[PDB]
C-alpha cells in the first residue's frame, strides 16, 4: 500500500470523504445549478446519444474537476513516485466502472420500447413493418458498440495499472533484498504473492464498487417502475411493493447463503493447512530419507482425507441453498408481476424491463459473492506479505 499509493490509511479515508462530499454536492440541493446555467434540459435520449448529451457532458466535467482537485491536494500534500497511477489511474478505473453501469442502465431502458413494439407486432400480423424492427436494433448496436470499446480499453488499463502495483512493490522489495534475504519463502513473496495480491485486491475493489453502483443506479429505476405494479401476490397492496420485495428477496438470498456458508471458509483454511503439513513432511523426506515413513504419510493423508470430506459434506448444504435460490429465481421477477399481467397494468416492455433490473441486481450480488469466494486466498496472501515484511520493518 505504502509502496504504490500515498499514505494509505489517510488516502482511502480522504478519498471516501471527498466522494461523499462530491455526491452530496451533486445528488442534492446544488447539483442542478450547472444545468440551470447551461441549459441541459433533462430529457436524455434512449439511443447512444446520451453519453455526449449536455447532462452527461456536465457530469463528466464535474467528475474531472473533482478528481483534479483531489489529485492536486494529494500531489502537494505528499508527492509519490506512482502518483499518476495510484490517484489518477484509480479515479479513471472508478469512472469507467460507473460508465459501464450507465451503459447497462441505457440498455435496460431500451428494453421497454423494443418489447412494446414486439407486443404490437405480435398483436396482429403485418401491423408493424420490419423496418421499425431494424431501427430499434440500430439503436441497440449504437449503445452496445460503446460498451464494446470502453470495456476493452478498461481491461487494458486495469491490467497495466495492476502491473504497476507489482512494480511499485517489487522495486521496493528488491531495494531491501540484502536486509530481507534471510527470511524463508522470500523467493516467492517477491515473485508470486506480489502479483496475486495486486490482482486480487484490484478485482475485489472493482467488484465492490460495481455492486454499490449497480444498486445505486437501479434503485430509482425500480422505484419509478413500481408505479405500474399496484398489487403484489398474496400479500396484497404494499406501498412501493416492487422495490421493497426485490430488496428483501435479494438480501434474504444473500443472507441465507452467508449463514449456510460461514463454516465453509474455516473448512477451506483447515484443509489447506493439513495439505501444507503434508507438503512440509514430503519436503523433509525429500532429503532426510527417514522422515516420510509409511506410518507418517498414512496418518497425514488420513487427516487430509477427512478434512476434505468434511468440506465436501458442508458444501452440499451450501449447494442446496444456492441452487434452490437460483432456481426459485428466474420465475420470481415474473411472480411479482403476475397480478399486473392479469389486470393489464403493465405491457410487455415494462415486464421485460423489470425482469432485467432484477436480473442485473442479482448478477451484481452473485459477482460479489464470487469475490467473497476468493476472499480467503486474498487474506492468506496479505497475511503472508505482512509477515514477510514485518521483520525488515
Amino acid at each position, epitope marked *: 500500500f505504502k509502496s504504490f499509493f500515498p499514505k494509505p490509511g489517510t488516502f482511502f479515508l480522504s478519498a471516501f470523504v471527498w466522494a461523499l462530499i462530491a455526491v452530496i454536492f451533486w445528488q442534492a440541493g446544488g447539483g442542478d445549478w450547472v444545468a440551470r446555467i447551461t441549459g441541459a434540459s433533462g430529457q436524455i435520449p434512449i439511443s447512444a446519444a446520451r453519453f455526449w448529451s449536455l447532462d452527461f457532458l456536465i457530469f463528466y466535467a464535474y467528475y474531472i474537476v473533482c478528481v483534479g482537485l483531489f489529485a492536486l491536494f494529494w500531489f502537494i500534500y505528499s508527492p509519490h513516485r506512482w502518483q499518476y497511477w495510484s490517484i489518477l489511474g484509480t479515479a479513471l478505473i472508478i469512472f469507467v466502472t460507473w460508465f459501464l453501469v450507465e451503459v447497462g442502465v441505457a440498455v435496460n431502458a431500451w428494453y421497454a420500447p423494443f418489447y412494446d413494439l414486439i407486443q404490437t407486432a405480435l398483436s396482429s400480423p403485418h401491423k408493424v413493418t420490419i423496418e421499425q424492427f431494424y431501427r430499434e436494433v440500430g439503436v441497440f448496436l449504437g449503445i452496445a458498440l460503446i460498451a464494446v470499446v470502453i470495456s476493452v480499453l478498461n481491461n487494458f488499463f486495469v491490467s497495466h495499472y495492476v502491473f504497476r502495483w507489482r512494480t511499485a512493490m517489487n522495486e521496493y522489495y528488491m531495494a531491501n533484498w540484502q536486509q530481507l534475504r534471510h527470511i524463508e519463502g522470500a523467493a516467492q513473496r517477491v515473485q508470486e504473492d506480489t502479483m496475486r495480491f495486486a490482482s486480487t485486491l484490484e478485482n475485489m475493489g472493482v467488484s465492490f464498487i460495481n455492486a454499490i453502483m449497480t444498486l445505486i443506479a437501479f434503485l430509482p429505476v425500480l422505484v419509478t417502475l413500481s408505479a405500474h405494479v*399496484p398489487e403484489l401476490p398474496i400479500i396484497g*397492496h404494499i406501498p412501493y411493493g416492487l422495490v421493497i420485495a426485490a430488496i428483501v428477496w435479494s438480501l434474504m438470498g444473500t443472507g441465507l447463503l452467508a449463514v449456510v456458508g460461514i463454516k465453509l471458509p474455516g473448512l477451506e483454511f483447515k484443509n489447506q493447512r493439513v495439505e501444507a503439513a503434508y507438503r512440509k513432511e514430503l519436503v523433509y523426506g525429500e532429503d532426510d530419507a527417514t522422515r516420510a515413513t509409511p506410518p507418517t504419510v498414512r496418518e497425514l493423508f488420513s487427516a487430509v482425507r477427512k478434512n476434505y470430506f468434511r468440506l465436501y459434506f458442508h458444501y452440499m448444504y451450501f449447494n442446496i441453498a444456492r441452487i434452490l435460490y437460483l432456481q426459485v429465481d428466474n420465475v420470481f421477477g415474473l411472480f411479482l408481476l403476475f397480478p399486473s399481467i392479469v389486470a393489464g397494468t403493465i405491457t410487455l416492455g415494462l415486464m421485460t424491463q423489470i425482469t432485467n433490473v432484477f436480473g442485473q441486481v442479482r448478477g451484481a450480488f452473485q459477482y460479489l459473492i464470487n469475490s467473497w469466494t476468493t476472499l480467503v486466498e486474498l487474506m492468506s496472501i496479505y497475511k503472508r506479505l505482512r509477515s514477510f515484511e514485518h521483520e525488515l520493518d
Partner: nanobody
Amino acid sequence: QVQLVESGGGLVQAGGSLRLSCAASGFPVIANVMYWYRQAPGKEREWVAAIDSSGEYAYYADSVKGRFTISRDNAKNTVYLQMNSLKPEDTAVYYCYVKVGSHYWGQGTQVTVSA
C-alpha cells in the same frame, strides 16, 4: 353481492373536466384496491387508474399520468375519477372494477368527447 353503479355521464366538449363515480353497494370494500378501466370504441379494455384502500396511494396509466386524478371516499364506499383537459383520444366507455372473492365489473358509462 357487490354492485357498482357509475354516475357522471359524458357527452362533453373537448378540453374540459369531468367527475366519475363508482358507488358500491353490498359487501364493504374498505379493504380493497379499486381499478378504473376504459374500453375504446372497437378496441380492447385498457387500464386507467388504481387506488389503494386508504386512498393515499394512487397509480395511473402511462398515457393518463398527470391528467387523471383518482381519489377514494370510504364513507359512501365510493371511488371518484376527476378528468382534467380531455383529448379526443379519451372517448371511450369507462368501467369500474373491484375483486371481492370474485371479480366485479360495473356498468359502463359513455364519456363521449367531441373535438
